[PDB]
Design a protein around this motif. Structure first.
Motif, PDB file in Angstrom:
ATOM      1  N   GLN A 146      -8.436  -0.327   9.740  1.00  0.00           N
ATOM      2  CA  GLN A 146      -9.319  -0.547   8.322  1.00  0.00           C
ATOM      3  C   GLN A 146     -10.391  -1.601   8.585  1.00  0.00           C
ATOM      4  O   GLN A 146     -11.314  -1.577   7.725  1.00  0.00           O
ATOM      5  N   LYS A 206     -10.084   0.922   0.900  1.00  0.00           N
ATOM      6  CA  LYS A 206      -8.841   1.957   1.152  1.00  0.00           C
ATOM      7  C   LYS A 206      -8.243   2.355  -0.164  1.00  0.00           C
ATOM      8  O   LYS A 206      -7.805   3.472  -0.433  1.00  0.00           O
ATOM      9  N   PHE A 223       0.868  -1.202  -0.026  1.00  0.00           N
ATOM     10  CA  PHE A 223       0.057  -0.083  -0.162  1.00  0.00           C
ATOM     11  C   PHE A 223       0.766   1.453  -0.054  1.00  0.00           C
ATOM     12  O   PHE A 223       0.570   2.276  -0.920  1.00  0.00           O
ATOM     13  N   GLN A 255      -5.612  11.629   9.668  1.00  0.00           N
ATOM     14  CA  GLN A 255      -5.743  10.901   8.466  1.00  0.00           C
ATOM     15  C   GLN A 255      -4.578  11.467   7.610  1.00  0.00           C
ATOM     16  O   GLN A 255      -4.348  10.689   6.563  1.00  0.00           O
ATOM     17  N   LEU A 256      -3.621  12.302   8.178  1.00  0.00           N
ATOM     18  CA  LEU A 256      -2.232  12.644   7.393  1.00  0.00           C
ATOM     19  C   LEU A 256      -1.100  11.996   7.913  1.00  0.00           C
ATOM     20  O   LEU A 256      -0.964  12.072   9.161  1.00  0.00           O
ATOM     21  N   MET A 297      -6.625   4.538  10.144  1.00  0.00           N
ATOM     22  CA  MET A 297      -5.966   3.613   9.172  1.00  0.00           C
ATOM     23  C   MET A 297      -6.956   3.241   8.132  1.00  0.00           C
ATOM     24  O   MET A 297      -6.743   2.288   7.214  1.00  0.00           O
ATOM     25  N   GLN A 298      -8.275   3.681   8.067  1.00  0.00           N
ATOM     26  CA  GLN A 298      -9.388   3.537   6.918  1.00  0.00           C
ATOM     27  C   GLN A 298      -9.490   4.326   5.754  1.00  0.00           C
ATOM     28  O   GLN A 298      -9.419   4.197   4.919  1.00  0.00           O
ATOM     29  N   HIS A 299      -9.809   5.870   6.438  1.00  0.00           N
ATOM     30  CA  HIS A 299     -10.202   6.612   5.249  1.00  0.00           C
ATOM     31  C   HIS A 299      -8.910   7.761   5.314  1.00  0.00           C
ATOM     32  O   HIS A 299      -9.006   8.731   5.310  1.00  0.00           O
ATOM     33  N   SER A 300      -7.743   7.208   4.662  1.00  0.00           N
ATOM     34  CA  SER A 300      -6.525   7.681   4.683  1.00  0.00           C
ATOM     35  C   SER A 300      -5.482   6.773   3.942  1.00  0.00           C
ATOM     36  O   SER A 300      -5.771   5.680   3.953  1.00  0.00           O
ATOM     37  N   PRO A 301      -4.249   7.475   3.620  1.00  0.00           N
ATOM     38  CA  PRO A 301      -3.357   6.510   3.003  1.00  0.00           C
ATOM     39  C   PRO A 301      -2.481   6.098   4.072  1.00  0.00           C
ATOM     40  O   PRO A 301      -1.238   5.599   3.822  1.00  0.00           O
ATOM     41  N   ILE A 302      -2.732   6.039   5.324  1.00  0.00           N
ATOM     42  CA  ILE A 302      -1.728   5.624   6.443  1.00  0.00           C
ATOM     43  C   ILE A 302      -1.772   4.174   6.653  1.00  0.00           C
ATOM     44  O   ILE A 302      -2.833   3.688   7.099  1.00  0.00           O
ATOM     45  N   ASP A 303      -0.522   3.533   6.326  1.00  0.00           N
ATOM     46  CA  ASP A 303      -0.398   1.875   6.425  1.00  0.00           C
ATOM     47  C   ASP A 303       0.447   1.734   7.731  1.00  0.00           C
ATOM     48  O   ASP A 303       0.648   2.673   8.431  1.00  0.00           O
ATOM     49  N   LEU A 317      -6.858  16.756   8.344  1.00  0.00           N
ATOM     50  CA  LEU A 317      -7.002  17.058   6.987  1.00  0.00           C
ATOM     51  C   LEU A 317      -8.273  18.303   6.768  1.00  0.00           C
ATOM     52  O   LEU A 317      -7.785  19.146   6.107  1.00  0.00           O
TER      53      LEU A 317
END
Ligand code: K
Ligand code: K
Ligand code: K
Ligand code: K
Ligand code: K
Ligand code: K
Ligand code: MG
Ligand code: MG
Ligand code: MG
Ligand code: MG
Ligand code: MG
Ligand code: MG
Lengths: 251, 252, 252, 252, 251, 251
Positions: free
Chosen positions: D72, B81, B50, D21-22, D43-49, D235
């Motif tokens: 997520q 995601k 990801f 989310q950042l 960790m769901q509605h974000s790009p955070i892995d 965000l």
């Protein structure tokens, strides 16, 4: 054990790959082809130290010598790459004897140079006898890319501790007032390239050149270049994709 | 403000897409700028996770192709995601049954059509205020057909309203049918199975896609009426190119 | 061109493996160059994600040990992605039933033996043209036994053809049996359970592995006939070493 | 040596938490140093892995708020890995049934109360030798209520002993009930459903949390007796701030 | 609040860890041991800025002062590390008074130095009164690693704005023509080390040294070194693993 | 096609964002607002090359011109950023004519400068005619942040190949012996800022300034600044969070 130096000691040139794309998978795949070395370009690419480090490992595993064309002729950058297992260094924009001496200074431990001691990865490859053989384990080439470097070629070639020079022919063409065309036919650029090769060989030094095609690389090998790179991963991949698309679309 | 693949289809034309197994943004953008309608990022048979896929989606969009992802698994939360990170096409592996196809569909649509969770970080930036009212149309969803079981269940899979259609993986299909896992296999039983899937998809009014390992095979698949054709993986194209450069360089 | 652990076993010898919870390639290569036959990367009780495991596998291979991974979960798609990234041994948690063991086995073998998806990015580079014909033998698969239920089901788990055997996690077993989660526990009931698993594994013609927290405990496990013994986690060894350096530095 | 949210609750007070989310550590630490009791990483509605969440947990802890994660998916192994990386609160999506709530609870507690796997890399550093004896109390677990089905099953979800309570997602609840996915929705049917969940949670002696998109809505939720209130996403706050700076800069 | 400066102000030396392996987990674990500081080595390691940044956070959380031994004595690199929450800087290859002045210039805001203002992480730690106390929050040590630095020791020690010097004894041994042995007994190297310590203390400055073992570190503390590091994570881990393997294999 | 140069050519200033937080999501979101450019700060932030590279892509996609305020006025760093698609460069601590010439040297291909040729991302944006238009595609501003730069302002402004200057008012205030207050009212600092603007405009050059608020930015635009940044992401986000907390807690 440096595969390029082995080529040279056995009377043959080395052919090397050239990577501008970060990542380990193509690096290993290309290293396993019939390349003697693979150069990772840290200048004209998005490859930083964090991304070069695993690529060196991948190239070594694949069975080619890992080289780096650095962003700049900076001693501490070069030293960190050596300790991370870069076994060849091509330093851009070496234009004067003093700049060539700065490159040499980074490649050798005292007394020959001033390289700082902490060889994390070379000590794993070579063992505790590394220090005695360290200078031979690394190939160092100063890039010749400008009118000034041309003018200073003999003084650059006089520097102990560098193996020779590596021509950057697109930058050289541009600095001569011509187009930065890959594999150029422009007569003045072709002449200057041959001049650098001749001077290097007369000085008992090695000379390399960057190529954009296999056909040009064949000619460079025939002309006697010791280290020939061909061709950049991104350019090869883009050309391949364009051809696949044309074939698919019946164009 | 349109999915470039759906635009192809709305014009009665197929889409041609790239296929990336190498992580990174530079080749992703460069290939997206070619005459590809989409570029699929393979998160299954690659080291692309990801963290690495996220900037690649951006690069493909900038380059002017539709960013697609072939996921490692048909998992709703993973798919959601990716959607919220700006994947606009999803190709999901191992869709072998109607229920698995329903699971794919569930992830692609907000309620009441599906159960997609709300938080469209990147699609809201691309599509702006008009996003939610067209959200389902902004995404293409294809169920992979790559097993004997999926082949047997092709009509039930195609009956699922919330998927655009299917995506054939010929090499895995060949292997699961007892044949060699050849790139661009033409094993007779596999060829027949693929022709059957294409016929059933069009009988059902659905789209059919196929993975290709070469421009020549892609040309044939386009001629056979496939709606979505990928060709060819970045790694394979690059390795073959390098091998040929070496051969030319070392030639007499 | 051989799995170093399987070579040990083919010689009637056990394999000794390292255990990494710290991400990064430098210690991975350094430890692989020691007299370890394998180095296991722990993706469960560590912060090591896929992005970080991928280069570590390369480093271990270069160092000359077999790269193994203890996954966070027995999930086929995760396992397949690791195999294609050059994990050559898989230790999967929470294999508590025959069906869960079958799920592990399914991921490790191409059809018809399993359902492993085809795209062996890194194994094809290591093994070359001969890969597919020997693919199953290039990978070692061990089901973790770490619960009361797994202990009860040990014979059914061991009956699954497509796994090499089992890997005991003594601390979790102790905790699940109602005891303290001690490193290298010797709680009597746990000792008996472990001896039972070893006996049942060898009765079934399967391999048995065990996690160890010390060289001394590993020595005993090797003497007891275990086939695969890990010792000891990088973090634990490093922290203990540093504590001792400090004590020596601050001594009178 | 205490979970700051549980300390709030033990004093009969609610906790107020941030919402990220950042990815990145700098704003995480800066916001943790504010008068937030916790900071939730989405960790769901974000790009955070996982790779990016791990250092963020450290930064939040240093800043002096309790590190929480909204995962997520309600997956035990993902949750366990986060716990061992120093997530001290878990908010799990799509807990729609008693059995799904039990699955959440199972991940949060060592045997015999749950089945949490043992290897507490970071909690052992924070809590020291006293960790295991208080481990369950160091973690807060909340099941998300974001569907019609979860609403119908609220009492059965709240009956699960091993969860602290529930966390309402109003926008997804609105969308699943057939309404617009508004931030801080006040759609009448949704308002009634939320009031019902709060009443049922307190009838059951459990905690109730709620996501908010603004300080004003959070103020009302605190006044209504919610135990855990988040406000507002990094965000959204940043984008609104920038829009206002631009408007002020470009004003006549 | 700088834990090393607190040691010094309270009449005690500081003992510090030394990390060449990237990552936060061992960094925090070692910081929670009885180390006063933990130095992250950005020179002889694969640790770049991207990886050092979270490690500083982890060390601070663990309760040791985060230090960095930089790749090079470069002001802008040092400034970026300070603003990321490095609270000690050890700069390699400081060989002249002017190089020591370049180090000092980076560690202090105007008028004392030229450090650029934007203290992202120190302002979170220290609050709005940071500026007034900023110089004290950072420890700065110039490394003495060469014959030239030895020769220039008094001129280096004269520089206002550096706390003192940090001996790099393997590089120093190598530059003196000896083996780069950790914790060496070589008489000339041992003598030079004692000389630097004596000169530093006579100048009212602090002196540190890098060690490869706890036993050598104990001696260095007894000799009066103010800042003693022991021992590198990778070396400690490798030695521990070798011993575990020998024990397991009954060797 | 450089959106800032288009503003200027059309008689309007440019308003730009300022990022100290790494990552692509807020970068794209802010780029889609009514900013003409977004500056990524690589000096007072934890943003390294690896993290800046995707942020440039995200800003370009969002429809603002991607700019970078570099860690240092180093030619090779700047060149690598240009080739990664930074289309504006703000270089800190340009204090002399020679330093301004060093900045200019990096921004232009020979004969005008010495920029090395390998424009990975600009060639994708602009195509094969990039070389002829390359200089115009990039905006270059030298930062004026010290008493020395003030004193040398006319000599800096005389340098061909830079578009103008960018005032760093917090560093400037600090170097003048004042507090490094954002948007300061301190009369001497306000006077020096106006002086630099006036000199730049008289020299036919552009002048920018860093702001901490929209209200100050409005005044700067009214005073005639050509390039105005407002306000840092982290500061805007922190202030927003404090207000949300106060509202929620009824404070
Ligand atoms: K080779
Ligand atoms: K395109
Ligand atoms: K080995
Ligand atoms: K707080
Ligand atoms: K400590
Ligand atoms: K814009
Ligand atoms: Mg060049
Ligand atoms: Mg949801
Ligand atoms: Mg498959
Ligand atoms: Mg377990
Ligand atoms: Mg040294
Ligand atoms: Mg400044």
């Amino acid at each position: 054990h440096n595969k390029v130096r082995t080529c040279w000691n056995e009377g043959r040139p080395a052919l090397a790959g050239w990577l501008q794309l970060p990542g380990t998978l193509h690096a290993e795949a290309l290293a396993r082809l019939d390349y003697d070395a693979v150069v990772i370009d840290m200048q004209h690419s998005p490859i930083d130290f964090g991304q070069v480090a695993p690529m060196l490992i991948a190239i070594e595993l694949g069975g080619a010598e890992p080289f780096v064309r650095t962003q700049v002729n900076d001693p501490s950058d070069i030293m960190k790459l050596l300790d991370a297992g870069a076994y060849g260094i091509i330093a851009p924009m070496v234009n004067t004897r003093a700049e060539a001496q700065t490159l040499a200074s980074a490649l050798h431990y005292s007394p020959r140079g001033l390289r700082s001691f902490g060889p994390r990865r070379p000590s794993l490859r070579y063992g505790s006898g590394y220090l005695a053989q360290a200078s031979e384990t690394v190939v160092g080439l100063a890039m010749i890319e400008t009118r000034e470097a041309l003018a200073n070629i003999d003084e650059i070639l006089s520097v102990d501790g560098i193996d020779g020079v590596f021509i950057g022919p697109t930058d050289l063409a541009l600095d001569l007032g011509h187009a930065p065309l890959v594999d150029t036919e422009e007569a003045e650029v072709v002449s200057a390239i041959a001049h650098v090769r001749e001077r290097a060989h007369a000085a008992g030094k090695r000379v390399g050149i960057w190529c954009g095609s296999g056909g040009f690389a064949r000619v460079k090998l025939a002309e006697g270049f010791d280290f020939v790179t061909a061709a950049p991963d991104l350019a090869m991949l883009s050309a391949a994709a364009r051809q696949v698309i044309a074939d698919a679309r019946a164009l």
